[PDB]
Amino acid sequence: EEERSKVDDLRGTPMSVGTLEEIIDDNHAIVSTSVGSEHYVSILSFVDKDLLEPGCSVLLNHKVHAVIGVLMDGLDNQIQEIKESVELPLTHPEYYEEMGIKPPKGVILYGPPGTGKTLLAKAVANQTSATFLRVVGSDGPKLVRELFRVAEEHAPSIVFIDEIDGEREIQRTMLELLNQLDGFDSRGDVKVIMATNRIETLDPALIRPGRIDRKIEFPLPDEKTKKRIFQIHTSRMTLADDVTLDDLIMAKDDLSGADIKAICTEAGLMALRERRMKVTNEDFKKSKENVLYKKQEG
Amino acid sequence: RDKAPVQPQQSPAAAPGGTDEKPSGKERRDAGDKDKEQELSEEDKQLQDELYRPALEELRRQIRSSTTSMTSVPKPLKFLRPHYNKRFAADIISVLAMTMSGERECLKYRLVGAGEVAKEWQELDDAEKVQREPLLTLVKEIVPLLMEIEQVDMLEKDIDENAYAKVCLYLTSCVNYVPEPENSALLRCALGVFRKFSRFPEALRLALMLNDMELVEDIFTSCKDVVMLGRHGVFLELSEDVEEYEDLTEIMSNVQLNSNFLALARELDIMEPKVPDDIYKTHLENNRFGGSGSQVDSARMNLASSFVNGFVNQDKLLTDDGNKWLYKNKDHGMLSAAASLGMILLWDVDGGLTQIDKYLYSSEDYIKSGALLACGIVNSGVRNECDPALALLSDYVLHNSNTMRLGSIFGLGLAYNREDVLTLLLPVMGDSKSSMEVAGVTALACGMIAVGSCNGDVTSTILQTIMEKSETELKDTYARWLPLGLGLNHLGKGEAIEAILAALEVVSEPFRSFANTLVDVCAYAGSGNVLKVQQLLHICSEHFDSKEKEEDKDKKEKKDKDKKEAPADMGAHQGVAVLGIALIAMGEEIGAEMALRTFGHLLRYGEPTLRRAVPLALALISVSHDADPEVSYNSIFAARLAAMLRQLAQYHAKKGTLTLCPYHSDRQLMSQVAVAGLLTVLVSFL
Amino acid sequence: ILDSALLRPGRIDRKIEFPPPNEEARLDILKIHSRKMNLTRGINLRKI
C-alpha cells in the first residue's frame, strides 16, 4: 500500500500529456509534444508496453518525464472460388490445411448493372460472424493510410471497398494506393476486396499488380443470390403461393438494400390499406411502381 | 348523435325509464360510446340505487370496467349471475371479461387460498374457445386452481398447432417463470393430452423429465398398437435414465410378449447402425495420424497420443502401427494405453475378448488392471467380468486387485439401487486406502449408478459413508470428490428437504462445510426464483475461493438451457479464477460468435491455470475457426502441458446426467499429475 | 423558385399563387397594420 502510494509524486502536480512515438529495446522510450520534445527515461510500472500500440498520446511531466503510466483514449463457379478465397481462413478448413495456397492479394468484383447490388450481395454473405468495413468513394492518401493501418489492426477480419472509380493526382494516388496495397514492406495482413462498376475505366495497373489470383466477368444479373436476399428480407414477412419471385427480381434494376427495404416497407404499407397481413404480387408491383416512378421522374 | 337529448333520461330514479332506457344503451354498447365516458361523475349517485336490476348491474360493471379500478369492477358481475361471431359480442365479451376475470382471478389467487368465479372462468374458457384466438388466454392463465380439466376440455378437434404452441410456451415458462411445484401437474396434464394425441416424441420427453416406469411401457404398447424403429429406439435409450430403464427391462424381462424388448435389453441395437455408416458415408486420410503421430515426444505428448489414439474411434491401423510403444511408456498412461483398447472399440464383443486377453494376467500389474478397465469400458451389457474381479476384491493391506478394483468397479459404474454390489462396495469404502483414486472411482462409479433415483436415500449408505468420511480428516481431495457422487445419488429429488436436513445434520469447519455446500449445490435442479439469485449475490463475497468456484460453477448447471443470460460480468472482475468460472460457464453449446468472442479474450492470460483452462472448454464447446485458437497457441508457445492439451483439443474437435458427471468432476482437474490417467475415463465424449 | 424546381424536379411540393397587392387582401392587412399605429376614424382606406 505504501509502495503503491509512494508514486504519487510523479502522477501529482508536475504532470502533462505527451505523445509517444515508438518503443525501443534499449528501455529508454521516445515521446513527443507540440514542440516535439524527446525524453528518454527508464521504464516504470503500470505500463503494458506490448498492447500499448505506440504512436498515441501518453502521460508526461514537468519533471524528468519518467513515465508513471499510460492513458488510453451463373456465378456459382465464380462465387465458390471467391468462397475458397475469402472464406479460406474460416469454417470447413480441411480443403486448405492439407496443402494450402494463401494468395492474400485480394480480388476484383464488377459487372454491367453495377449500383453495388451484386457487390453488397456478396458482401452481406460474409457478415454472419465477422467485423465488416465499408468504404465508398475515392493532400495525399492520408485517410487511405489511416484506413490501411486501422485495417492492419483489424487484420483478422474482412475489408470491403465499394464504388471504386486534379486528374493527374488521381493517377499518382492510384499508384500510391497500388504500392501500399502491394505490401512491399509488410507481409500478408488482411484480405482486401475491390468492387466497382465498369472494368474498362480502370487502368491495367489495377489488375496484374493488384490481384495475382483470379478475376471473373459478370455473366448475368444473377437472380439467385438476389432471390436469397429477398427471401431474407421477406422471412419475417408473409406471402402467398400465387406470388412469383422470378418476374419481380427480374423486373427490378439497380436497387440497394435501403431501396428494397423501402419498397417492402411501402408494400406492407399498401397492404395495410385493406388491413391484410399478407402481401400479394399485384400489390407488390403496384407499390413498387411508386418508387420506380419516383426516382425516374427526377 | 348528440348525448344531449338522452342526458336527462338518466336523472330520474323511476323504474320504467331505466328499464326501457337500458336496451338502447345496450344497442349503443357496441363501441360502448363515441367518447371517453366522462358520465361516471354524473352517474356516481346511482351506485346507492338498486327483476331487470341485474341489467343495471351489467351497465354499472360495464362503465366501471370502461374507465378503471383495482377492486370494484368484477363485483357487480359476480353479484349478477349472468343469464338470458359478431363485433358486438366479441367486444362486450372477449377483452372485457379477459381483463375483468383476469384481475378477479389474480386478486382471488393473491388473497384467498368460490365456485361462482370457477363457473364464470369455465364460461369464459368456452367463450374464448368460440373466439378461437389462442395463446392470450393461455399466457393469461399461466399464473393462476383449474388447469388439467380446462386444457382437456379445450382440446377436441384441432391437435398439432394447439398442442405444440401451448405446451412449448408453457414448458418454456415452466423452465423460466413458473415455479417447480406446478411442473408435476403440468407434466401430468401433458401426459394425458399426449396420451390422447399422436407424435410420441413429446410424451417421450415427458418420460425423460418425469422419470416414470409406466410411461415407457405405454409408449411401447402404443408402438405395438400402431406401427423409424431403430431410431426411436435409439433416442428412447438416450431419453431413459438408470432407474426407469431397469424397471422397464425388469417388467419386459417379466413378459413383454415380443422378445424384441429383450432384444433391446441386450443393447447393441443403438450401437449397430453407427459403425458401418461411419465407415461408408464418411472418410479420413492418414495425414492427421502421421503428423500428430510424429509430433509427439517426451513421454507426455506420448500420453496425449494415447488419448488421441484412444478417442479417435474408422482407422484401426494406428493401433497396429509398430511395437514397444507401450513398453517405452510408464504406468502414467500405460494405464491409459491399456484402457485405450477399451476406448477404441465400442463393438466386437467376441473380438474385444481376444484383443484384451493378451494383456490379461500379464507380467505387469498396471497393464492387466487397465485391461480390466478396458473390459469395463467396451461393453455395458456384457458384465461377465464381474465375478473374477469380485472374488479378488479384498486385498487386505495392499495388492494389484485394488487397481483391478478401480478398473472393474468404475467400468461397472459406466455399465449401469443394486444391493449386492453395494454390500461388496462396503468393505471398499470401509478399507480407507491412502490412495485417493480408490475412493475417487468408488464415488464416481456409485455416483453414476445412483443417478436418477427418487428423492435420494437417507439410509445407511450415506449414513455410514458420512460417518466414515468424518472418522478422520486427511487429504481433502476425498472431501471434494465424495460430495460429487453423493450429489449424483441425491439427484432428481422434487420434495426432498435433504439440503436443509444436511445443513442441520452437519455443522463443522470449512472443509465438511465445503462438502455440505457442495451437496447444497447439487441439491438444486433449478426453477424460477429470486432466492438463488440473492443467495448468489450474497455468497459471491465469500472469502473461500473454492466454494466460490463451485457455487458459481453451478450457474452453468442451472441456466445452461437459455444462453441469453449466460454471459455475465464475472469476466470483468479482478478475480483470478472467476474468469475461469465464466470460462467454464461458457457451456457445451454451439459456441456462437459471442462465445468465440469470450474465448478470444480468455485465451491470453498470465497464469498457467487459466491457460490450461481455456483449451478444454474451447474444445468442448466446438465440435479454421476451430483451428484458430490452436494456431494462437502455436503463436504463444512457439509448455509441455500446452502441447499435450492443444493436441488433446485438436482431436477433441473432430438433461442426461451421463454427460453431466464427467466434466463436473473434471472441474477438479488441478491436482497431482497422477490423475492424468483418470482424465481419460470421461464418458461425456461422444 | 425555378432553381428550387431544379433541386426539386416535381417530387414533393405545394404550390400556392401569390399575386402582389391583390386587393381585398390589401384591405384587411392594411387594417392589421393600422391596429398598431395610431389612425383616425375620418380616413378612407379603400381608395388609397
Short mmCIF file of C-alpha atoms in Angstrom, two decimals, chain C residues 12-39:
data_model
loop_
_atom_site.label_atom_id
_atom_site.label_comp_id
_atom_site.label_asym_id
_atom_site.label_seq_id
_atom_site.Cartn_x
_atom_site.Cartn_y
_atom_site.Cartn_z
CA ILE C 12 -42.87 16.87 -53.22
CA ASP C 13 -44.27 20.41 -53.18
CA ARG C 14 -47.38 22.51 -52.56
CA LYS C 15 -47.98 25.37 -54.98
CA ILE C 16 -49.93 28.49 -53.98
CA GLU C 17 -50.18 31.52 -56.26
CA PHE C 18 -49.25 34.79 -54.53
CA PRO C 19 -50.19 37.88 -56.56
CA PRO C 20 -48.68 41.08 -55.16
CA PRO C 21 -51.26 43.54 -53.81
CA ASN C 22 -54.33 41.53 -54.88
CA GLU C 23 -56.88 43.76 -53.12
CA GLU C 24 -59.45 42.53 -50.61
CA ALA C 25 -56.17 41.01 -49.45
CA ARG C 26 -54.76 44.53 -49.13
CA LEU C 27 -57.66 45.90 -47.05
CA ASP C 28 -57.58 43.51 -44.09
CA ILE C 29 -53.79 43.54 -43.78
CA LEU C 30 -53.91 47.34 -44.03
CA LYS C 31 -56.29 47.25 -41.07
CA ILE C 32 -53.86 44.94 -39.27
CA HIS C 33 -51.06 47.43 -39.94
CA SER C 34 -53.45 50.16 -38.77
CA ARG C 35 -54.00 48.38 -35.45
CA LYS C 36 -50.50 49.03 -34.10
CA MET C 37 -50.04 52.60 -35.34
CA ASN C 38 -52.41 55.43 -34.42
CA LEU C 39 -55.04 56.14 -37.08
#
